[PDB]
Amino acid sequence: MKFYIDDLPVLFPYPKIYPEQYNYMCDIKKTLDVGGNSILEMPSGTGKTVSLLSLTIAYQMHYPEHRKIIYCSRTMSEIEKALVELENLMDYRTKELGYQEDFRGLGLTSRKNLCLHPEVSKERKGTVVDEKCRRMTNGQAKRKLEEDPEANVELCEYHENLYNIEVEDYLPKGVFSFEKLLKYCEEKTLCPYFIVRRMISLCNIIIYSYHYLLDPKIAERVSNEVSKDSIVIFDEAHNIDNVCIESLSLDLTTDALRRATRGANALDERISEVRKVDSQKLQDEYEKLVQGLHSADILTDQEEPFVETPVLPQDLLTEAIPGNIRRAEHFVSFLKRLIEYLKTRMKVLHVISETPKSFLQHLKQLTFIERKPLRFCSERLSLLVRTLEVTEVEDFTALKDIATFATLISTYEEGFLLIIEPYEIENAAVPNPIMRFTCLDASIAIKPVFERFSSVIITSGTISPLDMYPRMLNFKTVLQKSYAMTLAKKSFLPMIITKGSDQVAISSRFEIRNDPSIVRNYGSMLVEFAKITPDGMVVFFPSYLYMESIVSMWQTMGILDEVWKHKLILVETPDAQETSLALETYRKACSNGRGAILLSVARGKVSEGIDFDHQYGRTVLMIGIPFQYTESRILKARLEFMRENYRIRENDFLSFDAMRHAAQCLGRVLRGKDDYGVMVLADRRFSRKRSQLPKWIAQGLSDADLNLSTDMAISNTKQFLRTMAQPTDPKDQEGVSVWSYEDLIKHQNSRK
Amino acid sequence: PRKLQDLGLKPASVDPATIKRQKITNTHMTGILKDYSHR
Amino acid sequence: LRGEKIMQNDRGDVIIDRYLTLDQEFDRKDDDMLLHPVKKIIDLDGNIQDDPVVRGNRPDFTMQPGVDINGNSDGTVDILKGMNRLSEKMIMALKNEY
Amino acid sequence: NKDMCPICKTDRYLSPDVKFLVNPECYHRICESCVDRIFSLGPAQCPYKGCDKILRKNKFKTQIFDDVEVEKEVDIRKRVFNVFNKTIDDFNGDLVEYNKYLEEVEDIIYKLDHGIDVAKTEEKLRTYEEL
């Protein structure tokens, strides 16, 4: 349809529109017009991405500011889905306006997911792919070939072919998803990664993940190209704190330090050989360093620093090199003694938690390393590695971790902690000491975003309660609200099971993980629900270890044998490729009617973007509250920091963290309003967490289902499925849950 | 073993002193009833 | 083949045990037979490779495969992979030449 | 030269209480028993093959770092910093001069570490301690 807001015409790509979608678009427009940030919670069963794209695109194409759009999701599959939705919307707009309006919309990702080189795309890790692509595109090979054609160094045809054409003619006008972009770039022998990286500054809407906006290692270069007045959308942003925390966290192991020593020795030998044969490079680098130049002024735009900036751009010192690490040999000795200090600190016999200030003071006492020279470690190492002609950097890969740790610890002092644990795994014959540098404040990484961008939309399907997010991340919202879906008939049945058919309490507490009664009760619940579930059944476990142990117990008891008769069994595995193939097999089994059951981890890879709708997702078994590991030093320190700073109780934060993932898994069942499912939360502890669930799930959770039994839940599930299998009366949803153009006009007239 | 432990060397033995050493009413049915004492 | 953890105490049969390594090789061959590029919609490898320079805090032992005192795998992941491969093989066998 | 005294070959297995000390003069590992037996009466030549530098018992100390080269460099750094000790305010905030001074100190430390100009560098240290 094509309807009108107060002054903004918006073209919806469907003849029908939901009242929730209309209200959501109105609220988003109000937020954009008034300026500031907002928090929106939309039900998972109502089109959210389509409404967001429609309203934002109409806003940008109608108003004269023509503000660009930045879309930030949590996963690459979500980027693909958003790009597909954008392509559909643009197709509708092109069919309605009579012409293809000037528009360019691209996604952005790493080299591993966009490489077409037959010899570089066959790697199992992205770091190696990046290193090889740098070897083929840094310009060293091109310069060597220019000076001497006989040089055996080879180039990348995809990268070379781009120089022939201009940036504005890289791709035709339109929206390019990853699949279409790969097909086009394969047909024309071009590099999609470089196409996107060079067209970000020109696209109307750019779609990427939260890492490309929060992680300073890859965020600075991309952010330097986007506009300052663009709209910012955070889709599925309920789990943004974890990303913000992991952005500025490092872990060092004994193997890492042992490899760093070897890397330092190799660097010293390389410096010696280059000193013997070609020293003018060292002299030139030293001369440039003396004036006060940095990596920005030394490195060309074509090349990149060896060590990614681990701190935010605003926290980098703008002064010249201190002088202690101005020379190659002096810097090498400094780095070597830093590594030795780390090694001698890795010998503690009990957990030690210390602040960066204390660590720096002890360093300055035992050795003579000052804070300022430490702050420049990564930058100096990047310049040195660039100038030493180190085409093979396998030996030097280790020094990156040391540089990152040094530049972080010497940079930040508040909201950061250093934990040294003699036992990385308590269940180990020999000690394996580990040093973790952890960020406790989740607002440090996101402050620059909230200050640089004026209007920020934070939208999600299971972001509740909305009051904590402004508390946890220091930002203020003009409005924060959640929508209640105006269902004509109940389509999803949420229930909580606190005990088994034997009336014995059931829980997923780790200390009682290996309990015959609880394990057998869970297995009986699984079998009974699988017997009645038509096509698909997703089970989410609190942790992978718990899933493994309980599955082994079920295998011994023979419950899996009973499940096999009715459905195939697919299990999530650590290997990402194997998990993806398992997902494909599960979808095929659900489509062909064979019936399948998928076991996964509530905090795993499936729950962070894979969506089960219609035939794929019918019943969701949340086996226990996905509580984090309480006996974790990092989590305990974060809880203490939050209690002291934001006045958030440890129990409250833990319950919020678990309920957030439970709701995340729950919300992957509905796409439209014609989809239905049964959502069983199997734990005695959910009975008091109804107020903590999202509003649209709490409203559907009845008081009689707060504490049920397995048999009674099976009966309710059978009745609910039988009821939902009947044809819906069109009049029951003609104008109460689905609105036509006339109904929308009537709503606008009544409201006005 | 005590001397070996005192010198910090693990002793692979123990002191042997520490080894703790460790009117029936009806009779026409006689010879018929098996003793199902336990289950 | 039943997807049960093998116990070292169990004696087994001498004749049949000769084929265990051949079964390992056959499992590798079947893994290659089943492996193929996956659609970007449900491509989980791309999710982890989206940012190849992610360095944070290593996951707790509850988020990693079970291990024993000696540090080697406990073997419970093997049965999971076995059942997963069984389901995949059945589904693939459905899509035959016929 | 892994876990036993090179002189008396006292293995840690047979001597769990063995503790190895180091001497800055030559940085040669030696056990406390050997130190006591060889240097109790007075100074004597180092008990090593190829080392003829005398040392005193009072100079022995416990090794901090596991790398002898870094230990040597850090000890020489301590000796240098005990003489060349200045702050940013010493140059009235002149960062260029402070950086040049730091570079000179690092060069002196490197020369002492690698024996480039031992006599001249030591004479310069002796003069600067006076001034």
Ligand code: SF4
């Ligand atoms: S330039 Fe593009 S195609 Fe060539 S190696 Fe790099 S990422 Fe791959």
Ligand SMILES: [Zn+2]
């Ligand atoms: Zn000795």
Ligand SMILES: [Zn+2]
């Ligand atoms: Zn000696």
